[PDB]
């Protein structure tokens, strides 16, 4: 019996280890996919430059488009520094504030979700609040509705 107890502890241990390794593998695959996408984009861009140099008749149309995209990216960055009110901001570290405000939005959404449940159950008519209140009062004696 004592041996079984030890086995149980061991299995709990391995459960926790499995949880952690599952997590780690998840982030590792996430990073792997991210770098896969990035390497793919880099090589595609390399190929585009190869075509541009080979097809120099391209006539900087792609260059014009990229310059316009650059201007638009600049404009978007300024707009975000405004909305987020983060003059201290760069493309490299904007990811950190993005995940930060993702957590922020998660907090806001979870709050408002609890709020939504409370408002939904607030549909209970006036009579229920009373009946509960006087029931509590009769059982304990006078108590405040907030404390009820």
């Amino acid at each position: 019996q004592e041996k079984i107890d030890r086995y149980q502890v061991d299995l709990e241990e391995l459960s926790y280890r499995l949880e952690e390794q599952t997590d780690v593998v998840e982030e590792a695959g996430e990073l792997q996919a991210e770098y896969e996408a990035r390497t793919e984009a880099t090589e595609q861009e390399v190929d585009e430059l190869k075509s541009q140099l080979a097809d120099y008749q391209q006539a900087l149309d792609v260059q014009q488009t990229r310059a316009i995209q650059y201007q638009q990216a600049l404009q978007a960055l300024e707009r975000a520094r405004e909305l987020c009110r983060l003059p201290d901001l760069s493309v490299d570290n904007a990811e950190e504030w993005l995940e930060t405000f993702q957590a922020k939005e998660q907090q806001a959404t979870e709050a408002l979700l609890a709020l939504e449940q409370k408002l939904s159950v607030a549909d209970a008519a006036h009579n229920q609040f009373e009946q509960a209140y006087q029931l509590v009062k009769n059982i304990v004696g006078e108590t405040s509705r907030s404390e009820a």
């Binding site: 499995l18 695959g29 984009a41 995209q69 493309v91 806001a108 959404t109």
Partner: protein, 99 residues
């Protein structure tokens, strides 16, 4: 209700800010077009700058490739260790049933 409309507006603020940050994340590469923007301003022969940019892209691509390879090896490592935990757990749990 008043508090909840206020929280709703706060959620809206978070939504818009997150969306903007996402947009710039999308435009990440476009900021690399700063070279393209300057390259476009040449308005003359600029194949040499194109070749320089292509070489830089080649270096970046090779760096990304190595990064991907080492990340892949790391991920595989994690995979085998996780599988080993799986096997160990299976065996231990089987022995638990048997006992």
């Amino acid at each position: 209700q008043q508090d909840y409309e206020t929280a709703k507006h706060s959620q809206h603020q978070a939504k818009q800010q997150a969306f903007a940050l996402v947009e710039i994340v999308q435009r990440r590469v476009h900021f690399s077009y700063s070279d393209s923007a300057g390259m476009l301003s040449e308005n003359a022969d600029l194949n040499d700058k194109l070749r320089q940019r292509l070489e830089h892209a080649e270096s970046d691509r090779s760096r990304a490739r190595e990064q991907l390879r080492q990340q892949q090896a790391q991920y595989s490592q994690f995979n085998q260790v996780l599988a080993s935990l799986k096997s160990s757990y299976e065996t231990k749990q089987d022995m638990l049933k048997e006992l």
